[PDB]
């Protein structure tokens, strides 16, 4: 008869002070300690029909884990102190838990039974702690599939979908190839997602593990004029299309022509590329330390742009959004199963 959700309160792991966090482009969060992780995992009730696992769109918003993570199972394993088993069960579903442990907004946390009248359990933080402990203990090594049947799939795009597909086919026994336009593979993770939220060292380590597995990534290829679909099909059985979605809509209004307006995607890509190459010293990006920054259109991209400007020490930074501010508590027409739409006050 566990009573953790009654006799334990939700907590957060070590977090750097926001004032000093703008001086360095590193992680803005840390994993839970062993005792804290055990206490937080004790909160989970081993949910009957866990709503933290449905992974489906409800009222136009996703609820639960779309990858059907065994959240109660590794919660109980963490509470009992079994880390290898928790990591194994987690990897049974998620092949890149390191990214999700610090990137995912955790709709599972919102769509959980304990979310009613009480805070939910830190599923994302527990996942991050599990994967970090596994990496530090060196339990993650290439599987080296002994069975390899001559077959080619030639995935296109190095985004997380591409990496997951490549891993699955390689484990099946198919020698695949991943084509990427940019120098560094990882899709959105390498460039779009800020280094602050996800340092690229872990991404590069993941690509190194995949290469050791035998994915054989190839970069600097637009697979357009460079490589044609006809020869692609001729030399490959399947080709897949993990092209993602980078097209950005604009505003067809007057005044959007004066020099000084650039895409958020381009700005973030240039900033991260310069930071990776020469620590933003090559001056091959946009800097507004002494220039005002107006970012219009909220969301993850807006938050990342604001954080980048703050670290660049812009004199003034402002965020614009048409939709009204979220309330501090769930409304009548927004109960627990739906994704919460309350004030968050996230990073940046």
């Amino acid at each position: 008869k566990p009573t953790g959700f009654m006799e334990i309160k939700r907590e957060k792991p070590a977090e750097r002070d926001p004032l000093t966090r703008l001086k360095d482009w590193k992680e803005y969060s840390a994993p839970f300690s062993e005792e804290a992780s055990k206490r937080q995992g004790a909160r989970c009730m081993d949910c009957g029909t866990p709503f933290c696992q449905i992974g489906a769109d409800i009222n136009g918003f996703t609820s639960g884990c779309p990858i059907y993570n065994l959240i109660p199972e590794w919660n109980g394993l963490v509470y009992r102190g079994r880390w290898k088993e928790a990591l194994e069960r987690l990897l049974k579903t998620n092949n890149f838990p390191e990214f999700t442990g610090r990137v995912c907004p955790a709709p599972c946390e919102g769509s959980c039974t304990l979310a009613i009248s009480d805070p939910a359990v830190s599923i994302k933080n527990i996942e991050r702690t599990i994967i970090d402990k596994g990496f530090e203990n060196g339990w993650i090594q290439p599987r080296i599939p002994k069975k390899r049947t001559g077959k080619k799939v030639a995935i296109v795009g190095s985004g997380p979908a591409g990496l997951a597909s490549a891993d699955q086919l390689n484990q099946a026994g198919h020698s695949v190839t991943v084509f990427e336009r940019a120098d560094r593979a990882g899709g959105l993770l390498t460039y779009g997602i800020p280094n602050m939220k996800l340092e690229k060292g872990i991404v590069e380590r993941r690509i190194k593990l995949l290469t050791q597995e035998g994915i054989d990534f190839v970069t600097n290829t637009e697979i357009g004029v460079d490589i044609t679909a006809d020869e692609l099909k001729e030399q490959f059985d399947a080709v897949i299309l993990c092209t993602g979605a980078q097209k950005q809509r604009d505003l067809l209004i007057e005044g959007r022509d004066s020099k000084g307006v650039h895409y958020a995607m381009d700005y973030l890509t240039l900033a991260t590329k310069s930071y990776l190459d020469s620590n933003f010293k090559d001056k091959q990006f946009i800097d507004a330390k002494g220039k005002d920054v107006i970012v219009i259109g909220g969301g993850d991209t807006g938050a990342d742009c604001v954080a980048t400007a703050l670290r660049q020490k812009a004199k003034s930074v402002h965020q614009f959004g048409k939709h009204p501010k979220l309330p501090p508590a769930r409304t009548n027409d927004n109960m627990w199963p739906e994704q919460p739409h309350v004030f968050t006050l996230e990073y940046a």
Binding site: M45, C47, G48, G64, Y68, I116
Partner: protein, 1483 residues
């Protein structure tokens, strides 16, 4: 209904004995139920001695020789004459061939005009034949054997030729006159009985109940040798074992006649007939009647320390050659010169007898059976369990049971034989080898293991020593409907004892149970000596690896073993046939153990389903007469659950070895988890599995694994009848289903995926008792739950429509989902159909105990139902009296329906009268055959006060209704409830299973207003997971069977049909109505509306939404409202209205019973295994009425209370004045006071009336349920004796029973009260002047009694009050005692302690002055009201009486009372002191 016998000890023969016997039958007729008409004889019979004088007088042509050298037959023939003379000629030819002479034939006069229409139509031609013994037969036993052989040959010839003739009796000492006749009709039909020449030393009599309205003359008894009252629950196993042993039987007495008498038992006969056939065969084989009775129904020797060494040795020896015939049985057998009477092991039937000074014995179920002179009565005794009442006419004396048992036991050296011939299997200690495979994951996947399975069934078993609990019973589809491959185990569902036999509590009655198992070859049963016990014996069928290895390596030539690999590749039939051939070869070689192994299996070879293999081998060996020569050991990986072990045992397995489960435990231990060692883990697993199997047996009431093994207590769901007949003969499969090819395909598929599985090194999560994405479908999935909650909170309709669509379509969850409407009719408009306001009146909220739920949820459900006009059900936890008054705002928290369960916790006169419907919970879907247990930590003060118990003290709800041991007892309870509330509807809640239609017909005969059918998918607050999943059947089959059977028997119009179990949509309601349900129950869905999210943690008292918990902190989170329930019910009603409009039905009665509107959908045909089901059984509409019209006229009128008591007591009750009256009472007056008590309670309530206000004296013998539900202010006196159920549900008042003034014998030695007394009593006091029977004060909760001796199982489940016993006490005293205090006066304290149960009680001495004074005052009142010599003597010797008294008190009760008293002394108020003590004792 019942049995009786009137006899003379010395053998004097008269006609007054026969007349008295018919008088007893007439008196007992009131017990039986009422069928279509009263004039039709339900069934009766009379057995007497051979009337030589009458035959000589009435023949005048046949030369009858002296007494014992000629025999008399008795034959029922068809009205046709050609076959009649054909059978007569054949019988004469057989007699001449055997050498006996045919004296002649006679035709028995019959008065057909005195009989009912149906019995008139079915009346046969009654002709007797007289046989004269040849001179060679010196002794009468040889002549009786010759007649038996002749009768068996004639019966065999008749069945071969297809002729329908019956041999009612053929003996030289006994004659039977029986048929579909009432007691009054028997003498009229048989004009011979009127003649005074009829003289017999004894007359046995029986009257039946006939659950169904289509009995037969042959099925009526007395049978050839004995009368049996009750039921047999091991009939299939007994039949199979007997037909296996008959082939190997070899007797010198019969010689070559064994081939003629090979069938022994009749396949189409009833349980009583089969038992009689076995009894007579064993008697002729060379066994005395008493010996045969003891061997067939042995006393419980295992776990019973009250049995002597000789008796224990005898019963242990005979357990190796004859399994018990378990069940509630009262048996009375006779052989002309000897008469015997016995009861079952547990003594579940009543039997009282009188012995007079004129050497006359009157034995019967009831006591007020005939008028007797008290000055002539010598002894008033009862048939105690384990005691045989034996009379020898020639010797002219009653032979003591002690003498009989001692002689029979000492006739052979059974103890020496057991000590010598036993074989030991002591294993080597250094041969230890913890087995591991290195393909453990692959084998686990092949056999279906899951991470959920392990972590939630195997680890908890080790941790807790019991099968893990659960909640919210199965919502997943059946195996036949699930797309995923399923094990063959999931296709078989455990059965249970609902009516005609009760379940038992194995834990509390462990002295009755036995897990002993015999391995080896049985010896010569007819002539046993030594070799019969030269076998192995085990205390537990579950075998550890070391035990299995030792058995395999015994090597002993007499005890040989052979291993058969039950594996197949393509042809399952071929594999089974090779297994059969290997078994036969081993048997020929001399092997006595067959070890079916699933090991050495690979991707090419998949293991045969062990259940199928075991059943097929068992049936084959039984057919070939070789099963008794061997035993079956199973070594399978698909054996990790109590259900698996129980199924294997019940279908034939003698022992099982879960090597894969042991390996899983070893792996868990090695990887750090499960710190407990491998050996202790294995031992704990074995013990827990055996306990679970024992519970499964107790569900059906079988107390012995030996009987359960032969018995098949499982019913298949989705197995073809062809496969069933081939391998599971005797099992029920209503819809047939999949075939052997499909079974093999499923097994091969699972094996292939498991063995390939080249992606993951982990076990997939389970979905049996939880919902996982991509797992098995669950009806209450998150989508459905949230959609329903949102719809109910909005009061919105399209959301509800989406929820209904998701629940109904997109998956196949239930059988009803396989049906589709015709769609070719005349649709009407929604305005032409009945309103939702009228529709909702047929709905109910379902029973949910207050303790299981919270106060807020219970009151919300009650308020919603009352507002909507429906009915709410209060569970077995009682009700708060304050809820009977509507609140000022108009909300009513009263529950219209009040539930009556085995606990009888809150049952009271006020509780019963303040209701419109009284339900009797015979079983529920999740835990049908089980009871319950509420720990003290869960017994909060606000629950204890409601239930009338002490806070912090555990509560136990026994599985069975101790009143209801049979259908007659159910009828008696219904009568008592109707007396308590004449203005209420009596309902009986049963669970769907095979034969439930016949049980419903019997219930309708028992006069139940409403019959409720519950599916196995019903919810519960706490129950074992195995019981939740593998017990019960869907409500569709049961509802269809009940509807069809009631319509066929012409009882449908008399009863209202209700159904419940996963009724979530208007489509489900419509399907139930078409199947024939007028009312519908909804329990789980209202909870989901209130906020339940199917967490399945109700049993943990940790509901996050404050629905199924008593914690105030969690209750504060409750957000449910009655408005949401109202909206849900209205939406359901709107759905029903729309469906009715679409189908062109104007009214619910019009649509009910119209199965022609339904047809099999294309989805079912597309399904690869649901397309093999035969649903025509449900799609059938017999001609008749399809709606309740007749109000089920009860017998409230003509009752003693209405005729005499009320007309002279209403004015006194109204005025509040004293009133004393006196009546003469007979056994036909059953209740005698409940109506007056109900009137008092209605007028006043709990306060009742001032003490000793109404006084009712009764003279004579009282009927069943005397002084039931008598509230305060009423004082009943009884000069005479009473039957069972005295003081049932007493709510106050006084009951005094004193022996008749004319009876001068010792009251403390003479019996005066029936078996069950003060069951469920809450308050009051009583004074009994004599011994009582079994189960005295079973569930007392405050009643203080003084009794001069009691029987076994005394003070079983008491929770309060006091009991004073001025005499001896039976065994298993205080078995389940959680509260109250018992004071017993005895001389042998050691013997008393040995008799008592030591589990949860303490022994003390009377040291407190207050307690001593209270006991003295109680004895003073007893002696004042009784004139008891024992009480007077004790009062005179009070100083020594206190010293010799013994006190019994539960430990927790004593501690809680002491803590409360200490707090009161410290100066704390009652509520706060109780709360603090409860917290301290349950921290």
């Amino acid at each position: 209904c019942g049995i009786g016998l009137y006899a003379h000890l010395k053998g004097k023969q008269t006609h007054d004995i026969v007349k008295q016997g018919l008088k007893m039958l007439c008196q007992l007729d009131h017990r039986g139920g009422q069928g279509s008409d009263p004039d039709t004889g339900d069934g009766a019979g009379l057995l007497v001695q051979i009337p030589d004088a009458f035959f000589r007088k009435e023949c005048k042509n046949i030369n009858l020789p002296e007494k014992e050298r000629y025999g008399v037959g008795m034959v029922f023939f068809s009205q046709k004459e050609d076959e009649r003379k054909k059978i007569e000629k054949q019988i004469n030819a057989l007699i001449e061939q055997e050498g006996q002479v045919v004296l002649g034939w006679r035709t028995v006069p019959v008065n057909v005009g005195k009989i009912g229409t149906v019995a008139q139509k079915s009346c046969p031609f009654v002709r007797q034949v007289f046989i004269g013994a040849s001179s060679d037969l010196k002794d009468n036993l040889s002549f009786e054997r010759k007649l038996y052989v002749i009768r068996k040959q004639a019966e065999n010839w008749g069945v071969t030729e297809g002729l329908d003739f019956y041999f009612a009796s053929l003996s030289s000492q006994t004659i039977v006159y029986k048929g579909l006749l009432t007691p009054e009709q028997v003498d009229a039909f048989y004009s011979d009985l009127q003649d005074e020449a009829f003289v017999s030393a004894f007359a046995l009599v029986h009257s039946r109940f006939s659950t169904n309205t289509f009995p037969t003359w042959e099925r009526a008894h007395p049978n050839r040798y004995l009368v049996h009252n009750g039921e047999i629950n091991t009939l299939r196993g007994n039949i199979n074992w007997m037909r296996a042993r008959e082939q190997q039987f070899v007797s010198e007495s019969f010689g070559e006649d064994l081939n003629k008498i090979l069938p022994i038992l009749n396949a189409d006969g009833s349980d009583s007939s089969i038992l009689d056939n076995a009894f007579e065969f064993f008697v002729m084989a060379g066994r005395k009647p008493a010996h045969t009775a003891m061997m067939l129904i042995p006393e419980p020797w295992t776990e019973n320390t009250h049995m002597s060494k000789e008796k224990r040795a005898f019963y242990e020896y005979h357990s190796s050659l004859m399994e018990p015939w378990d069940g509630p049985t009262a048996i009375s057998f006779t052989d002309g010169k000897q008469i015997g009477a016995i009861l079952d092991r547990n003594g579940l039937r009543p039997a009282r007898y009188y012995v007079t000074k004129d050497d006359y014995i009157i034995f019967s179920s009831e006591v007020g059976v005939i008028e007797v002179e008290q000055e002539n009565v010598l002894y008033k005794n009862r048939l105690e369990p384990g005691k045989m009442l034996l009379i020898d006419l020639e010797e002219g004396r009653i032979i003591s049971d002690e003498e009989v048992k001692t002689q029979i036991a000492t006739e052979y050296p059974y103890q020496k034989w057991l000590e010598e011939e036993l074989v030991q299997v002591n294993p080597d200690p250094e041969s230890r080898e913890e087995e591991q495979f290195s393909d453990l994951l692959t084998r686990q996947k092949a056999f279906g293991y899951t991470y959920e399975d392990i972590q939630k069934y195997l680890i908890p078993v080790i941790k807790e020593g019991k099968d893990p609990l659960g909640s919210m019973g199965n919502d997943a589809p059946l195996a036949v409907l699930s797309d995923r491959a399923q094990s063959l185990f999931n296709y078989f569902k455990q059965l249970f004892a609902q009516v005609t036999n009760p379940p038992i509590d194995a834990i509390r009655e462990q002295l009755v149970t036995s897990t002993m198992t015999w391995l080896g070859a049985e010896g010569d049963l007819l002539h046993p000596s030594e070799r019969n016990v030269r076998r192995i014996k085990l205390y537990t069928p579950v075998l550890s690896n070391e035990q299995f290895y030792a058995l395999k390596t015994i090597v002993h030539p007499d005890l040989k073993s052979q291993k058969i690999d039950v594996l197949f590749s393509e042809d399952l039939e071929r594999g089974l046939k090779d297994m059969f051939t290997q078994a036969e070869k081993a048997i020929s070689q001399g092997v006595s153990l067959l070890i079916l192994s699933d090991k050495k299996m690979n991707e090419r070879l998949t293991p045969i389903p062990p259940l199928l293999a075991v059943s097929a081998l068992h049936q084959h060996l039984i057919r070939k007469g070789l099963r008794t020569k061997v035993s079956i050991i199973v070594e399978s990986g698909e054996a990790r659950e109590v259900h698996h072990f129980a199924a294997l045992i019940g279908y034939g397995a003698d022992a099982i070895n879960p090597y894969l489960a042991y390996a899983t435990y070893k792996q868990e231990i090695d990887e750090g988890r499960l710190d407990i060692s491998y050996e202790e883990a294995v031992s704990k697993y074995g013990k827990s599995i055996t306990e679970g199997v024992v519970k499964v047996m107790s569900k059906m009431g079988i107390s012995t694994v030996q009987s359960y093994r032969g018995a098949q207590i499982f019913e298949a769901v989705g197995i073809s009848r062809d496969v069933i007949d081939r391998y599971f003969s005797g099992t029920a499969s209503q819809l047939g289903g999949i075939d052997l090819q499909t079974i093999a395909e499923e097994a091969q598929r699972r094996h292939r995926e498991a063995y390939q599985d080249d992606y993951s090194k982990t076990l997939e999560p389970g979905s049996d008792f939880q919902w996982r994405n991509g797992g098995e479908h669950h009806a209450f999935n998150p989508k459905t739950i949230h959609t329903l909650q949102w719809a109910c909170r909005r009061n919105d309709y399209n959301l509800f429509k989406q929820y209904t669509k998701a629940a109904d379509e997109e998956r196949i969850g239930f059988l009803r989902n396989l049906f589709a409407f015709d769609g070719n009719r005349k649709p009407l408009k929604l305005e032409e159909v009945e309103s939702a306001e009228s529709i909702v009146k047929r709905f109910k909220t379902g029973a949910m105990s207050f303790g299981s739920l919270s106060k807020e949820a219970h009151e919300a459900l009650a308020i919603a139902m009352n507002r909507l006009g429906g009915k709410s059900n209060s569970g077995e936890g009682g009700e708060d009296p304050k809820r009977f008054v509507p609140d000022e705002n108009g909300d009513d928290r009263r529950s219209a329906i009040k539930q009556i369960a085995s606990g009888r916790f809150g049952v009271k006169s006020h509780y019963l009268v303040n209701a419109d419907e009284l339900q009797i919970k015979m079983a529920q879907g999740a835990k049908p055959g089980e009871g319950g247990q509420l720990p003290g930590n869960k017994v909060y003060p606000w629950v204890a006060d409601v239930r009338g118990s002490t806070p912090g003290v555990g509560l136990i709800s026994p599985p069975p209704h101790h009143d209801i041991y049979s259908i007659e007892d159910l009828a008696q309870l219904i009568h008592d409830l109707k007396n308590a509330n004449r203005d209420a509807r009596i309902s009986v809640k049963l669970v769907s299973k095979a034969g439930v239609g016949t049980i419903a017909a019997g219930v309708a005969k028992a006069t139940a207003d409403v019959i409720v059918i519950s599916g196995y998918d019903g919810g519960t607050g706490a129950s074992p997971k195995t019981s939740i999943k593998h017990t019960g059947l869907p409500w569709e089959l049961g509802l269809a069977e009940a509807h069809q059977t009631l319509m066929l028997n012409g009882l449908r119009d008399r009863v209202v049909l209700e159904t419940d179990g996963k009724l979530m949509t208007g489509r489900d309601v419509v399907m139930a109505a078409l199947l024939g349900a007028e009312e519908f129950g909804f329990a789980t869905a209202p909870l989901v509306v209130l906020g339940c999210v199917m967490m399945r943690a109700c049993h943990l008292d940790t509901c996050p939404v404050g629905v199924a918990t008593q914690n105030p902190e969690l209750r504060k989170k409750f957000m449910g409202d009655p408005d949401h329930i109202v909206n849900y019910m209205l939406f359901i009603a709107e759905e029903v209205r729309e469906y009715m409009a679409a189908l062109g039905f104007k009214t619910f009665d019009e649509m009910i019973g119209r199965t022609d509107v339904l047809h099999v959908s294309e989805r079912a045909k597309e399904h690869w295994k649901a397309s093999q089901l035969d649903l025509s059984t449900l799609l059938y509409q017999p001609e008749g009425v399809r709606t309740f019209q007749s109000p089920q006229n009860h017998k409230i009128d003509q009752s003693l209370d209405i005729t005499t008591i009320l007309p002279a007591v209403q004015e006194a009750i109204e005025s509040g004045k004293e009133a004393d009256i006196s009546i003469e009472i007979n056994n036909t007056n059953r209740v005698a006071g409940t109506i007056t008590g109900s009137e008092i309670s209605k007028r006043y309530g709990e306060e009742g009336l001032p003490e000793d206000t109404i006084k009712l004296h009764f003279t004579g013998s009282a009927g069943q349920s005397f002084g039931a539900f008598v509230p305060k202010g009423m004082t009943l006196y009884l000069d005479g004796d009473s039957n069972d159920y005295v003081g049932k549900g007493l709510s106050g008042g006084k009951i005094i029973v004193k022996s008749s003034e004319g009876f001068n014998s010792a009251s403390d030695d003479n019996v005066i009260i029936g078996n069950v007394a003060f069951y469920g009593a809450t308050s009051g006091e009583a004074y009994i002047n004599g011994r009582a029977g079994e189960r005295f004060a079973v569930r007392n909760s405050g009643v203080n009694v003084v009794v001069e001796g009691i029987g076994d199982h005394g003070c079983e489940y008491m929770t309060g009050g006091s009991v004073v016993v001025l005499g001896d006490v039976g065994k298993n005293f205080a078995a389940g005692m959680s509260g109250g205090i018992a004071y017993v006066l005895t001389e042998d304290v050691k013997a008393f302690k040995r008799k008592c149960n030591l589990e949860m009680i303490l022994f003390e001495s009377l040291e407190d002055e207050k307690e001593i004074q209270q006991i003295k005052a109680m004895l003073e009142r007893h002696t004042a009201y009784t004139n008891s010599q024992k009480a007077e003597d004790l009062l005179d010797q009070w100083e020594d009486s206190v010293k010799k008294f013994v006190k019994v008190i539960p430990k927790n009760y004593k501690q809680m009372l002491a803590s409360i008293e200490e707090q009161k002394a410290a100066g704390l108020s009652d509520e706060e002191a109780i709360m603090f003590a409860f917290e301290a004792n349950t921290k």
